[PDB]
A paper describes a structure:
Recognized as one of the most efficient enzymes, OMPDC accelerates the decarboxylation rate by a factor of 1017, and exhibits a net transition-state stabilization (ΔG #) of 31 kcal/mol. Its unique ability lies in achieving this substantial enhancement without the aid of bioorganic cofactors or metal ions, relying solely on interactions between the substrate OMP and residues at the active site. However, the key catalytic amino acids at the active site are highly conserved, including two lysines (K281, K314) and two aspartic acids (D312, D317), which form the so-called catalytic tetrad in the sequence Asp317-Lys314-Asp312-Lys281 (numbering from the human enzyme).
To further explore the structural basis of nucleotide binding to OMPDC, we synthesized CMP from cytidine as the starting material. This allowed us to examine how the C4 substituent influences binding, as CMP and UMP are identical except for the functional group at C4 (an oxo group in UMP and an amino group in CMP). These values are pretty similar to those estimated for UMP binding; however, the crystal structure analysis of human OMPDC in complex with CMP revealed a completely different binding mode. The nucleotide binds in an unusual anti-conformation to the active site, with only partially resolved pyrimidine and phosphate gripper loops, indicating high flexibility. The cytosine base binds to a new pocket, where Gln430 of the phosphate gripper loop is typically located in closed OMPDC structures. Interestingly, despite the different binding poses of the base moieties, the configuration of the catalytic tetrad remains intact. In conclusion, the C4 oxo group is essential for proper binding of native and artificial nucleotides due to its ability to act as a hydrogen bond acceptor in the interaction with Ser372 of the pyrimidine umbrella.
Author numbering:
A (entry chain B): 223 to 423, 431 to 479
B (entry chain A): 223 to 422, 431 to 479
The structure:
């Protein structure tokens, strides 16, 4: 029952952020999330500008930017709007209660003011999502739950993954999908994003990740960022990921 | 076979940061960590100065400080040195590889430059600690592993906790203890810090330290939301300390 990204964006219970994301994916023929693992704002903004047309999402780590300012994120928003991609702050929230709300809304970074998407760990319980949602729902933001992990020694068991899915379903007004290695929910309203993606050779190809394992979006860092021609690199990954998606439809 | 903090500070295999902490705990008669959950630097520094003598450790969330600058952390270090407490940045690191290293060492906060201790989740595997250690070892820092959650719906099963302990042992050069609700390791070189503490899921200091074997209580609102924060801090210090004395025998 595979539906296109475009049709999934029209589902009755789709979250507005997921619908926005699915629509630009279909329009631009990209299911590539760029992991912009850089330490200087100038390089972040030049990557966002040049690769913006190739990507559906730019994943940031604002807490490694040596020259972070809110004006930097203002300029990033302008690029996200112009090129049509979402901003995903890969903050991996894990606290609960009023702390996690302030970590999302306040402090120096004011993440919720500029990030369309954030992610959260589910190990402490739904308290992480609940705290974030007290901020994010008012702001029409979305959250991704880290449901699986392939790093060596990961402790996310089958039960851990099931709990993450159930948490997503109970908080579907804020949770819009998962970080995982494969499809973990059969509900088409949720997005699946997968890191550990390589064309060349523990990582897997887009065909494996998007085609066989049913994920929606590939997260790619060094395979693009460390290349000389980052644009051609992004395009290689975009074409691979998109053609894996198309072959899944039939 | 229950040892004093002072005796544990001298154990052959003790980490230098743990030894420093255990020594000042014994000296000052405190096993209280203040959770300084405040959003302005003025309140942070006024609490650190006033409660410094009563605490072994000040737990910070630098990323909720609306007026963070490095000069604020310079003032905090000055107070930590003067009153003799460690700074524990409760960052709950969870990323791996070069990203965690930059999150610990770099960015705006430069955590490793001022935090004696940080904590880390173990769910992604040992990559979190390995990455932190590449920064933290050179800087003589220490790390705490979150071995038990203590929150509703926690997913940390028995096997998860055991894995956290095994990971701490394999990384004893950098990992100095655990965040947990009770003693998770019988090795006295490791420290146990327990959150969720109130005199009245909260547990009492006498339950946490006396019966559950933990070393340090982490207390936020029980102190910070009281009118007289200094008297509240002294109440928690004496409860936790007397609980620790009662188990030595
Ligand atoms: N097995 C993996 C591999 C990469 N990643 C993440 O994917 C992003 C991109 O990593 P690369 O530079 O390896 O492509 C990083 O945030 C990295 O931590 C992951 O979470 N799990
Ligand atoms: N049951 C609890 C209670 C508090 N805590 C921790 O204690 C801090 C808040 O403490 P207070 O409830 O004392 O204000 C947070 O860092 C939180 O993570 C916990 O981990 N589990």
């Amino acid at each position: 029952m595979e539906l296109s990204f475009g049709a999934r964006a029209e589902l009755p219970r789709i979250h507005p952020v997921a619908s926005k994301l699915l629509r630009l994916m279909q329009k631009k023929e990209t299911n590539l999330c760029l992991s912009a693992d850089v330490s200087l704002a100038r390089e972040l903004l030049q990557l966002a500008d040049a690769l913006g047309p190739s990507i559906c999402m730019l994943k940031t780590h604002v807490d490694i930017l040596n020259d972070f300012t809110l004006d930097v994120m203002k300029e990033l928003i302008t690029l996200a709007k112009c090129h049509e991609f979402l901003i995903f702050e890969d903050r991996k929230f894990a606290d609960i209660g009023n702390t996690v709300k302030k970590q999302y809304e306040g402090g120096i970074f004011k993440i919720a003011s500029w990030a369309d998407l954030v992610n959260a760990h589910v190990v402490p319980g739904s308290g992480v999502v609940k705290g974030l949602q007290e901020v994010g729902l008012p702001l029409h933001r979305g959250c991704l739950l880290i449901a699986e992990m392939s790093s060596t020694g990961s402790l996310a068991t089958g039960d851990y993954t099931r709990a993450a899915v159930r948490m997503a379903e109970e908080h579907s007004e804020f949770v819009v999908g998962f970080i995982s290695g494969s499809r973990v929910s059969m509900k088409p309203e949720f997005l699946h994003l997968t890191p550990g993606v390589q064309l060349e050779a523990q990582y897997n190809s887009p065909q494996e990740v998007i085609g066989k394992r049913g994920s929606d979006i590939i997260i790619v860092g060094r395979g693009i960022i460390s290349a000389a021609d980052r644009l051609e690199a992004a395009e290689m990954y975009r074409k691979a990921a998109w053609e894996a998606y198309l072959s899944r439809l039939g």
